[PDB]
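Good morning N.,

You mentioned wanting to compare the apo and holo forms, so I went ahead and generated the holo version with magnesium ion. This is what I fed in:
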Amino acid sequence: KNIIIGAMTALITPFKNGKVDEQSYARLIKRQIENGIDAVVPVGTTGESATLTHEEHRTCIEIAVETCKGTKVKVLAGAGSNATHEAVGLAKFAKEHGADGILSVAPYYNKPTQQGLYEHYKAIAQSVDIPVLLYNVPGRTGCEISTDTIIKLFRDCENIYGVKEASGNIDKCVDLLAHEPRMMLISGEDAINYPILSNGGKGVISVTSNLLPDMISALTHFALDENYKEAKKINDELYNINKILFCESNPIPIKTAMYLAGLIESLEFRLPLCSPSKENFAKIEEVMKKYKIKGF
Amino acid sequence: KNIIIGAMTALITPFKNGKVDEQSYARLIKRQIENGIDAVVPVGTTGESATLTHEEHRTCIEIAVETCKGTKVKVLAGAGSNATHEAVGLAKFAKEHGADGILSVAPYYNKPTQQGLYEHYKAIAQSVDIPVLLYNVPGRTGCEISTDTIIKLFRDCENIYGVKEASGNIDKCVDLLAHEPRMMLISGEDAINYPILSNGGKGVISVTSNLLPDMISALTHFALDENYKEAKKINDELYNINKILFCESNPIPIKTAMYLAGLIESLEFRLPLCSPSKENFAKIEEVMKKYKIKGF
Amino acid sequence: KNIIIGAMTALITPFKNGKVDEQSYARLIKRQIENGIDAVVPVGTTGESATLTHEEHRTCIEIAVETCKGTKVKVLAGAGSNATHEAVGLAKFAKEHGADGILSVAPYYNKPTQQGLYEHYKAIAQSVDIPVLLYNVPGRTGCEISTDTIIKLFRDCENIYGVKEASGNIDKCVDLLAHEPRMMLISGEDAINYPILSNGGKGVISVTSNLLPDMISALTHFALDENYKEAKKINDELYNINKILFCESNPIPIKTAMYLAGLIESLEFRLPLCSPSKENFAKIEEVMKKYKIKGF
Amino acid sequence: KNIIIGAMTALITPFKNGKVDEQSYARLIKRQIENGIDAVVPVGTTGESATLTHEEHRTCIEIAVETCKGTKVKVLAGAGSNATHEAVGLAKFAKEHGADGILSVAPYYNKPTQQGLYEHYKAIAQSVDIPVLLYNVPGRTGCEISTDTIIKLFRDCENIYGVKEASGNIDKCVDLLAHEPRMMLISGEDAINYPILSNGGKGVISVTSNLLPDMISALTHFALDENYKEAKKINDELYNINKILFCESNPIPIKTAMYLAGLIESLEFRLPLCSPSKENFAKIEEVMKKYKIKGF
Ligand SMILES: NCCCC[C@@](N)(CC[C@](N)(CCCCN)C(=O)O)C(=O)O
Ligand SMILES: NCCCC[C@@](N)(CC[C@](N)(CCCCN)C(=O)O)C(=O)O
Ligand SMILES: [Mg+2]
Ligand SMILES: [Mg+2]
Ligand SMILES: [Mg+2]
Ligand SMILES: [Mg+2]
Ligand SMILES: [Mg+2]
Ligand SMILES: [Mg+2]
Ligand SMILES: [Mg+2]
Ligand SMILES: [Mg+2]
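and this is what came out, ligand included:
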């Protein structure tokens, strides 16, 4: 299978006067490229996919594709939806506009059965010829892609090559790779990046890397080179920021941190997201003081 | 406050050849009207809101409004979204096209904070002048509207008049009505309709009533009249069907039951929803046997 | 079946200088009798059954039996254990020493299967000829007595007559009484006393009644007479204290309130239970001012 | 600090005609010694601590001590209780009778606060001068020893040297060793032995090692020697058996396997534990056949 692995960033989507700040977006992506990242994920959960229109979503995929040209950095385009016809449309767009693969979140809110998830992802995978990474985040979607369903999809569809796990369930990560060791398990939970990598995970799709791209890429690359001692070191050092970036619902803290670091111009969300409490603002600012944040 | 209460049905959306079966939809609504239902909810969770387009969602709201004209039956239009700008667009549409009020589910997938939920619903309520019923279903959305948040919205926004609770949490139902007894608490969970009504709930938004409208309406009207012995007897009789209708994710069982009863022509969903297992199909058919199903 | 129902109190066990304060225990029981309580439960969870020796447990049952003689008040003796041979010993002691029935908590820590729970309670029920009330509290025991197992035990063992439920699950309470309406469902969760009683539950085993026995007794008897307006009003009034009495693990808050009320001499627990935090101490003190607390 | 780490076994307790089969108990330990195990845990959860009397509990500690005498293998005696005065008595007994250290499970059923857990373990640690390993298993006890509480106890009581974690929470394992890398984190959950060890955990207290001591000891020793490749390979091979040994509550499956393998003479439990279902019996037998089970 064609794969997209290594250190990856779930890019925040900056807003200015309620519109996507397209120049800021390209600048943030170039900062990722210059700090050792292997791929970027436009419009994942961290990019506020829910509140972008289908047009803004497509614009952000294009900006990512254009910005990574002339580099090794791949674009793993966010293309999931809880409606299969929407997810297929996003997948075809990503392929036709030069994305290297797609991320595809489990349908949220309508809770498909395992049979429905299989049919959902088969339809998506049959619509394009580029790699497809599943994405399990049950605390947000209300559903779980079972290990058996992930393995069946991996074996039955040529371009489905792995899963981003954001489930806080290392037992499930053992289950996945013990029964199907050819799949690419990708960490979607920064605090446990190293444990997932040490069990044979092959990359991360990170929130923290928005702020600290050099640290996440170093951790991932150490782990892939089997220097687990140094990968663990960075994972342990990052624990405090990894946790504080979820003191409120992601991406509220990471955008707060990017704004405090001077990396975006305004602390702007689209409703229903909004600024953190005054207390959590101060907590984020305090934890940032322990880390060295790269500029542009 | 202006209110919409009593026995209400979360309408299924019949599909045929992949499109909304508009005639069948109108006929199903007339069957509800003729069996004592007080309001209908087009395009809630049970109506597959996630997989309809915005144009089909609007078409179904229009069909409900047109079908209920000249009757006592109200239209409480499904209008929620996880993007506040989409939820405002749906609310304004419902108002402008003659809905009696709106239902508005808590944002799914993006997990807003309590402050964000407040701003989300404040924006929706300020955009129209018709009643707004909040809708809490944390197992599907990944977030919970707290009792404090519900009460503040009820007190701060003129048109927000209560909440549909689908959280299996009778403690919260006590919390709500003990601290704010003027709100309209509505059961969103058929198996516990009677406990919610007996604590001062004023209506239900039912899945089971799709199949058994006369029984749910009777349960509710007995309960509102304080004939608790008779309301409890029906709630107890309905327990088996109320639960089997969730053997797989709603609306897969209720549509399966409607098809088995001959009330819709095709057992069609939109992916990622799909037919139940062969085992659950048989369980649904077996439980239906002990209930008397009204035809057209 | 012989039954023990109505308003019942899970008695605290007062300590002084590390020993059971026997005189105080009898005094507290007399106060319960004089305030309309129908039964007292010595050495349940609220009575710190875990940290009493087998001898003290037996002393406390004996004091309760002595104190209720010549009154209408029954003794439903705490007799549970996670070891069946221990639970049978307590059951036989309770019978031989004149208890009217026994409460028997689901085995904690060792998590028996449903078959194991069935055989456990069958062994207990076969060992005595007095009423046995099962007791389900999964948040504390780590196991659940399923509705099917409760009903099988009720139907198969002639002295098992119902269940004390402390599970926050009104759906299960409907399930229980819809399939086996002859059993006595007893509320083990003060905040939802009224919803359980209004669904056909027949009593409460209360924590709050230690402090406010007259109010819990009135609620229960109103509800048993289907005077639901008055029963719900008291349940609503009691909600704030019912919840604050679990700001820390029961019985830490209720013992704190009894001490603040001047009903016991010293705020004494047996480790690992201990005095509450300073804030929760003040929180308990503040909610108490809203209620009228009977003296001796 | 003095420590007890490496590959350890939570010994089953065989029964014969309802009594501890002491001669089989010693033989099982000797088989563990012969297969590379570093320490044995008499009368933990897997040893049915709940249903042994205090005297049987003590007898099993004595057998372990005597059996391991003159060998390199240590005895980490189960000494926990939900009553602090009982846990202190067991701790002192183990010290006085030659145990190398004690395991002490968090109090079950009575749900102490974090302050209570601290005082509980401080009382135990101060009663002896041998190493004390905390033991967190919230699914069984109903309480959690927080990371902050574990770390304070480790830093404040010289003999407290680590924690056996059975919580399915690799994030917490990162939290623990990132903030206190000096403690000995011990896996109490066989399926995730390797991820816990790969993050710096220093041993396992295993259920599976009862049946396959050579495989669990090898897994642990590869990981301690930083051969993560081979430690993960064994962890992956063992996943199927590691999970099936919990198809019913531990130790119901492990005793069933020990009996099927001819290693214990009778499949006897003490109520409320009992034989597994016929189906689960069959599943266990089927999974065991894929592994090489050492004899005596
Ligand atoms: N990524 C850009 C599109 C975002 C659209 C949407 N807000 C809503 C998606 C939808 N399937 C739309 C249904 C509209 C008719 N009710 C949903 O809300 O479920 C989401 O997926 O979160
Ligand atoms: N109610 C008075 C007796 C209380 C005894 C005990 N503390 C411990 C019960 C026990 N079965 C004792 C096991 C002793 C041998 N390890 C347990 O701890 O599980 C409890 O049940 O909570
Ligand atoms: Mg640009
Ligand atoms: Mg996606
Ligand atoms: Mg009437
Ligand atoms: Mg004791
Ligand atoms: Mg009367
Ligand atoms: Mg030997
Ligand atoms: Mg122990
Ligand atoms: Mg265990």
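The beta strands of chain A are 6-10, 15-16, 19-20, 39-41, 74-78, 101-105, 132-136, 160-165, 184-187, 203-206.

Happy to go through it together on a call whenever suits you.

Best,
F.
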